[PDB]
Every structure is written in C-alpha cells, then in structure tokens.
Amino acid sequence: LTCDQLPKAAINPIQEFIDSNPLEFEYVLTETFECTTRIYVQPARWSTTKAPTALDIKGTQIMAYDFVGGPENSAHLNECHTGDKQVWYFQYTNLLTDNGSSYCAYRCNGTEIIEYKCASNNNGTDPLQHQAMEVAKTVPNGDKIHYAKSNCPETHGCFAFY
Amino acid sequence: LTCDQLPKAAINPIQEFIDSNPLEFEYVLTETFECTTRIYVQPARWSTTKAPTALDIKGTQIMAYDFVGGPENSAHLNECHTGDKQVWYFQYTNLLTDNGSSYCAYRCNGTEIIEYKCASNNNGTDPLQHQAMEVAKTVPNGDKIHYAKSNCPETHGCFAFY
Numbered sequence: 001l002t003c004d005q006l007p008k009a010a011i012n013p014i015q016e017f018i019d020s021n022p023l024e025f026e027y028v029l030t031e032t033f034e035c036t037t038r039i040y041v042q043p044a045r046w047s048t049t050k051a052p053t054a055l056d057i058k059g060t061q062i063m064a065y066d067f068v069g070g071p072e073n074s075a076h077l078n079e080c081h082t083g084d085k086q087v088w089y090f091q092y093t094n095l096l097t098d099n100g101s102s103y104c105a106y107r108c109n110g111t112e113i114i115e116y117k118c119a120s121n122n123n124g125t126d127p128l129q130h131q132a133m134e135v136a137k138t139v140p141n142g143d144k145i146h147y148a149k150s151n152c153p154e155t156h157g158c159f160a161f162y
Numbered sequence: 163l164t165c166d167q168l169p170k171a172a173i174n175p176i177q178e179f180i181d182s183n184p185l186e187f188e189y190v191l192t193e194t195f196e197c198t199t200r201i202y203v204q205p206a207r208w209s210t211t212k213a214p215t216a217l218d219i220k221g222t223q224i225m226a227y228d229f230v231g232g233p234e235n236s237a238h239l240n241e242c243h244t245g246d247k248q249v250w251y252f253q254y255t256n257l258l259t260d261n262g263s264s265y266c267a268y269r270c271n272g273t274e275i276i277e278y279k280c281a282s283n284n285n286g287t288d289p290l291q292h293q294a295m296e297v298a299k300t301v302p303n304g305d306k307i308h309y310a311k312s313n314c315p316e317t318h319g320c321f322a323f324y
C-alpha cells in the first residue's frame with residue numbers, strides 16, 4: 001500500500017468540524033504537530049476567497065492555513081504566514097458521534113507519506129482512529145507515525161491550551 | 163467618569179461569540195493587541211471546568227484564556243500559559259446584526275483603565291464602536307487607547323491571519 005492509494009474520504013461540511021472544536025492530535029508524523037490543538041474557523045466576513053481556516057496551536061505558537069476543496073476530496077491549504085501550499089486528504093472522518101469526533105488526515109509526496117494528523121476530542125478512543133493509524137504506518141515513510149501526546153508541557157488551568 | 167463606572171453590559175451566550183468568529187481588534191490600549199485576531203472556542207469535551215476559551219492571535223503567536231462568568235457581568239480569564247487571572251467587562255456588545263458583530267471590552271485597575279479590546283468583523287463600521295471608544299478614552303489612562311491596525315504585516319493569501 002502506497003500513500004497515493006490511501007482512502008480519500010468525503011470532507012464533512014465545515015460546520016461539523018467547527019462544532020467539533022477543540023480537537024487535539026493523537027498521532028502525527030513529524031515533531032511539528034505533537035502536543036497540538038486544532039481549531040476550525042469559518043471564513044471572515046471580509047474574506048474574498050471565503051475559505052475557512054484550520055489552526056494548529058502548540059503552546060504559544062500558531063500555524064494557520066486557509067483552505068478550499070480540490071479534486072478527489074483534497075483540501076488545498078495556504079499556510080497564512082508564508083503562502084506555502086499543501087495538499088491534504090482524509091483517511092476517514094467520524095464527527096459528532098455520541099463519543100465525540102475523530103478523523104485522520106494525511107499529506108503525501110507521491111507514494112510516500114510526509115505528514116499525518118489524527119485528531120480527536122475523545123482522547124483517541126474512537127476504534128476507527130487506532131485502525132486508520134495502523135494502516136497509515138504501512139505506507140512508505142509511515143514508520144515515522146507516532147503518538148502525539150507523550151511529553152507535553154504542564155497546564156496552567158486550561159484544558160486545550162498551555 | 164472612571165473605569166469602575168463604565169457600563170458592565172450583559173454577556174451574550176457563548177455561541178453568539180463563536181458564531182462571530184473571526185473578529186479583529188479595532189481599538190486597543192497597549193501594543194500587545196495590535197494586529198490581532200480573536201477566536202472564541204467552546205469548552206473541550208474533556209474540560210472539567212467546562213470554561214470556553216478566548217484566543218488572541220497575532221501572526222504566529224497566540225495567547226489563550228479559559229474564562230467563566232463572575233459577579234456583575236464580569237468575565238474571569240485564566241491565561242493558559244501562566245495561570246494569571248484577569249477580570250474583564252463589556253462596555254457593550256452588538257453581535258450578529260445585518261452588519262456583522264462588534265463589541266468593546268475593558269480591564270480596569272480601580273479607577274484607571276489598563277487594557278481595552280474593541281473587536282469587530284465589519285472593519286469597525288458599527289457606530290456603537292466608535293462611540294464606545296470615545297467614552298473609554300475619557301476614563302483615567304484612556305488616553306492610551308488607539309487604533310489597532312495602523313501598521314500590520316502583509317498577508318500571504320489569508321484574511322484573518324498573517
């Protein structure tokens with residue numbers, strides 16, 4: 001199985017993601033997204049693209065990406081500080097269940113996987129999440145995929161921020 | 163007029179703030195909140211306080227505060243990185259109108275004002291906002307209040323983030 005053959009699941013309407021906020025990453029590929037909270041935001045009233053935004057928040061640092069849909073259930077992200085473009089897909093989504101929300105998303109470079117973001121608001125207890133992680137680690141470079149919350153800084157009174 | 167005599171307006175339900183996202187600051191007191199976007203977030207499923215969160219995002223830096231209601235329409239903020247507490251009030255709110263949303267919030271130290279955050283998603287065109295700003299600048303230390311968006315970094319394809 002190669003990265004290009006992973007499922008490209010249908011992307012739920014943006015409000016379902018917004019209604020899932022806040023989410024935390026459970027499994028990621030590089031260290032960049034360890035100990036990270038994800039927030040979805042509707043487009044600004046003054047946005048001329050009317051693209052929503054994904055926020056990756058790690059302590060006091062934040063990466064933001066406006067995004068729009070592309071071919072084959074892709075999400076085309078525009079990293080807001082650089083203008084750098086990224087193409088993402090979802091392995092699966094399972095939003096707004098009785099046990100909350102989870103999803104796993106990935107970024108390929110051809111047959112190899114180069115980034116992975118499994119998110120939840122239920123501390124990784126959706127059986128679909130563990131299962132997707134086990135499939136993703138079988139694609140080339142999937143060996144890098146690992147638990148995102150092993151060594152996170154202590155909190156100071158909040159729950160999704162530190 | 164002193165800071166303690168400013169209006170303490172009723173705080174709209176949290177969903178009305180969330181539905182206003184993203185907002186930008188129009189008038190602030192210190193430089194800290196210039197060129198800043200505000201995002202409201204519902205409490206995490208795993209939060210034991212069930213406090214929502216306000217996010218102040220300035221480029222790639224973020225301050226987060228969990229908050230709960232206090233006496234006399236106060237908002238009691240817990241800055242998530244330090245545990246430092248702040249007591250805020252709203253001068254007025256005007257959320258989810260035909261011309262979008264605006265509000266002005268302030269933080270006193272007794273009779274003096276020490277921080278001010280007027281937010282909107284309509285580029286400061288709510289007449290209530292200019293009017294509130296003119297009142298706030300008359301309390302002691304209100305002379306510091308000024309336009310928040312005079313020298314902001316260039317964007318790279320997004321609208322509420324840079």
Ligand SMILES: *[C@@H]1O[C@H](CO)[C@@H](O)[C@H](O)[C@H]1NC(C)=O
Pocket residue numbers: 109114
């Ligand atoms: C994809 O692979 C090649 C290296 O083999 C590299 O030149 C290119 O920048 C890579 N792209 C990304 C987005 O990592």
Ligand SMILES: *[C@@H]1O[C@H](CO)[C@@H](O)[C@H](O)[C@H]1NC(C)=O
Pocket residue numbers: 123124208
């Ligand atoms: C979240 O899940 C991990 C196991 O993956 C567990 O060790 C940890 O204590 C759980 N956290 C909470 C808040 O229950």
Ligand SMILES: *[C@@H]1O[C@H](CO)[C@@H](O)[C@H](O)[C@H]1NC(C)=O
Pocket residue numbers: 271276
């Ligand atoms: C309020 O005023 C005094 C200085 O006159 C200072 O000691 C105290 O820390 C101030 N509090 C805040 C929150 O600024």
Ligand SMILES: *[C@@H]1O[C@H](CO)[C@@H](O)[C@H](O)[C@H]1NC(C)=O
Pocket residue numbers: 046285286
């Ligand atoms: C926002 O308002 C200011 C005046 O306060 C104006 O100079 C600026 O061009 C406006 N921005 C947009 C995007 O219309």
